[PDB]
Design an enzyme around this catalytic site. Sequence first.
Site, short mmCIF file in Angstrom:
data_model
loop_
_atom_site.label_atom_id
_atom_site.label_comp_id
_atom_site.label_asym_id
_atom_site.label_seq_id
_atom_site.Cartn_x
_atom_site.Cartn_y
_atom_site.Cartn_z
N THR A 1 -3.73 -1.70 -3.15
CA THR A 1 -4.32 -0.56 -2.44
C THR A 1 -3.55 -0.23 -1.18
O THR A 1 -3.03 -1.14 -0.52
CB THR A 1 -5.79 -0.85 -2.06
N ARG A 2 -3.51 1.05 -0.84
CA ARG A 2 -2.91 1.57 0.39
C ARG A 2 -3.82 2.63 1.02
O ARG A 2 -4.47 3.36 0.30
CB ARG A 2 -1.56 2.18 0.05
N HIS B 1 -1.48 -6.16 11.12
CA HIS B 1 -0.33 -5.26 11.22
C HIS B 1 0.63 -5.67 12.35
O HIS B 1 1.82 -5.47 12.24
CB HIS B 1 -0.86 -3.86 11.45
N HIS C 1 2.98 -3.69 -3.64
CA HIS C 1 1.90 -4.41 -4.35
C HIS C 1 0.75 -4.78 -3.39
O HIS C 1 0.78 -4.43 -2.23
CB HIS C 1 2.46 -5.65 -5.09
N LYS D 1 1.50 6.20 1.85
CA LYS D 1 0.69 7.42 1.77
C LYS D 1 1.54 8.68 1.62
O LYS D 1 1.08 9.70 1.10
CB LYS D 1 -0.22 7.54 3.01
N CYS E 1 4.07 -9.29 1.20
CA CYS E 1 4.63 -7.97 1.06
C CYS E 1 5.64 -7.81 2.21
O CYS E 1 5.68 -8.67 3.08
CB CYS E 1 3.44 -7.03 1.20
N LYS F 1 -10.21 -6.65 1.32
CA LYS F 1 -8.81 -6.91 1.57
C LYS F 1 -8.50 -6.57 3.03
O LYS F 1 -8.91 -5.52 3.54
CB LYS F 1 -7.91 -6.07 0.63
#
Length: 381
Positions: A48-49, A269, A45, A348, A315, A265
Amino acid sequence: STHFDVIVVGAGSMGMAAGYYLAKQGVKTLLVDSFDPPHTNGSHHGDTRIIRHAYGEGREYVPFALRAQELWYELEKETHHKIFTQTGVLVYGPKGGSAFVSETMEAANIHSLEHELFEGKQLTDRWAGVEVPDNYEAIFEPNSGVLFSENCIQAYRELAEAHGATVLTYTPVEDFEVTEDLVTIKTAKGSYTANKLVVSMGAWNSKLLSKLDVEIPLQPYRQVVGFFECDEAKYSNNAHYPAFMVEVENGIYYGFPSFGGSGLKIGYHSYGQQIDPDTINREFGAYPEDEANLRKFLEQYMPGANGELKKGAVCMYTKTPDEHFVIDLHPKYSNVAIAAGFSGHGFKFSSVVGETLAQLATTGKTEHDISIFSLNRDALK
Ligand SMILES: *Cc1cc2c(cc1C)nc1c(=O)[nH]c(=O)nc-1n2C[C@H](O)[C@H](O)[C@H](O)COP(=O)(O)OP(=O)(O)OC[C@H]1O[C@@H](n2cnc3c(N)ncnc32)[C@H](O)[C@@H]1O
Ligand SMILES: [Cl-]
């Protein structure tokens, strides 16, 4: 009948894709999920990726990404949901100080991928909303872009069900009993069997793979993203602001142009909290790091996007020690295929992983090179 050709346990990014590639070739499939996919309790969720192709993490990822992109374009043609928009992907970092940028540039050269290089102020001349120090360098991949991840899963589900797939929601699998002839899954409201099993439980692979006697190092991490109000003239997809994945002083950040006034957004990481997926706190702002780490980046590099926090999402990544995926057959049971450990960069590829899982469940092999994703590799021992 409670018997199927294949059961897919965990119908999220990888499992729903596998279900589609199985069901479309007439394989009688049951997809079982703890929730109702797409949902907000797993790893798919936040809307977007990024997909990109100049993958410096290893040569095998490149044909995997190229196939994935072919499959995404095919999915776009089959559904009414938006799947992919070609924002391009910008990667930048300090000259002579970012392994990630270097590896990306090298990958783009080795594999002959279309790209453009920028240094310093040249970035801002192209995109007004980004500013980097003079000693930064960048590579832009114009052909890559953004997947609408929840739409991908929804499309795969709708198409898989129309092809004959059965989907069981709000039904966590509690145990597995497997032989080479018969797979049985146990749930609260009963048991189901199949010839073959695909296991793709995301963060819960770290808790439940032990039920199949597979013991590998998998660590779930709580990873937040924030959406910020921003100057649409600089940061909208309509203004051609790119998606980005960059290395700065405190590590790697990634983000997206605003779509339909969603806001920009962004995620960090290089840090997250080590968690158990059954007890994770899914409220953005529960930790002070959630907002703080994002604003520290925006105020320096994208200052016009450091506006109102419109919303946040929580997430999970599931990391292996080498951050390479696990895609393989079970070493004892040739009728069980496992997809795990996507280490925060698996979405991806979810199309091609789905295709791979369908080939593995159906033939016991795959045309794709998954040699670096094997269960038997030294990093997992
Ligand atoms: C969270 C994260 C990930 C991420 C990202 C940013 C964030 C914040 N950015 C990415 C990016 O831009 N590009 C990219 O390629 N990937 C990016 N990711 C990583 C990616 O999202 C993940 O690698 C990927 O989604 C993982 O897929 P997976 O299929 O492994 O995980 P899932 O979608 O959560 O699906 C798991 C499903 O299994 C169900 N489940 C769990 N336990 C059970 C049991 N016992 N029984 C039945 N079902 C079960 C879950 O409910 C879920 O649906
Ligand atoms: Cl992940």
